[PDB]
């Protein structure tokens, strides 16, 4: 405890950059979620709602792929037991990405049906 | 832009490579993403056509409209046994057009079909653009390589791809010949030299025996396995890890495509680490059902998992020697080509077979063919 090393600062900076990359992808997901809600609860004729939902397909697949590439980059990190702050940050980031992926899967279940 | 030099291009089944001879040496050219090899991939989307890394990067999002392995189809008839066997494993459609194969895709909302030489011409166009971006000069002249076993139709279709791409194809030379040229094997003083080319890279395994006499190259024999490579070695590792996760947690991660992909990507990276290190570590948080997977693999374990595959690479070497009517003791030079030849066990098995003989391996194996083609291009310019 209280043995913080300069070396861990390098891993924490790598994780912060990954956190920023996740925030950018999460902003794309937020727009997709708002558009999906807008179609489901909006005033488009029931005959045109299928086409509007179907148009989100390319973007949701691109968002899923971006999150998968972040997971692959996080998976390159090797953190010793002593780097407790980095291990907590890594775990928190993976769970955040996995939660986002589950939201992407919900979008996929609601389009092109 | 002013006129540039002639280039050497290795048009591979999965990756392609371009080199240029200048300032007395070969420079292998990095693409726009900084990679010294470029995926031989072309993707068709709702709005554009993507080539190389950009096409490989979106394969998971658009599998049916992302073409690769065009080299397996070029110059072949639709009914060729190779075409029919290969078609079963591709996510894109292959159709028959009056006896000739065509790839069929959705492009900008319309159904389109392309001949294999058209697909290869798009890959060649990217390689030409890669050379121009680096040189800051226009590139028109090139030497393109082909496998030694390619027939007249396969050789002609490759030339056609070059012409379509707007390249002036100076010459078409065999891949094992290009590798021998890179090492200056034709330049060694004395009588005829027998050369064995061991090419394990890009999803194919090719063994070739060449005899060089007064600078003339003659192919004596060819042997190999059309579908063998790094993916097979990586797979053995994946099976090992899936079994380890079952033993440790009593959970099967095999049906979760994302968990298998995270594991496969980590295995590919660990395999590369094992080229120069004796152990590799893997840490994957929340791999499956929130379980963290922290493990490691030694180079010895990697070798054991792949023992039958590695040993099996010597059967083609024996078959090529038999077909060339030569004793192993009669082989003057051994050349390593392709990324999998970086595996120390493969090098050891081959050096032991040839009773301690040193291997020609100083040139990056992935680049050796482009290197030789770049030397040939400089000679013809």
Author numbering:
A (entry chain B): 148 to 260
B (entry chain A): 1 to 381
How do the authors describe this structure?
HSP70s bind to extended hydrophobic sequences in newly synthesised and partially folded proteins, in a manner dependent on a cycle of ATP hydrolysis and ADP/ATP exchange. HSP70s consist of a conserved N-terminal nucleotide binding domain (NBD) with ATPase activity, a substrate binding domain (SBD), and a poorly conserved C-terminal domain which terminates with an EEVD tetratricopeptide repeat interaction motif123. The two main cytosolic HSP70s are the ubiquitously expressed HSC70 (HSPA8), and the stress-induced HSP72 (HSPA1A)3.
To discriminate between fragments binding in the adenine sub-pocket, other sub-pockets in the ATP-binding site and/or potential secondary binding sites on the HSC70-NBD, we screened wild-type HSC70-NBD in parallel with two HSC70-NBD mutants (S275W and S275F), which block adenine binding to the HSC70 ATP-binding site. The relevance of these mutants was confirmed by their respective HSC70-NBD/BAG1 crystal structures, which showed that both mutations overlapped with the adenine ring of ATP in the ATP-bound HSC70-NBD/BAG1 complex.
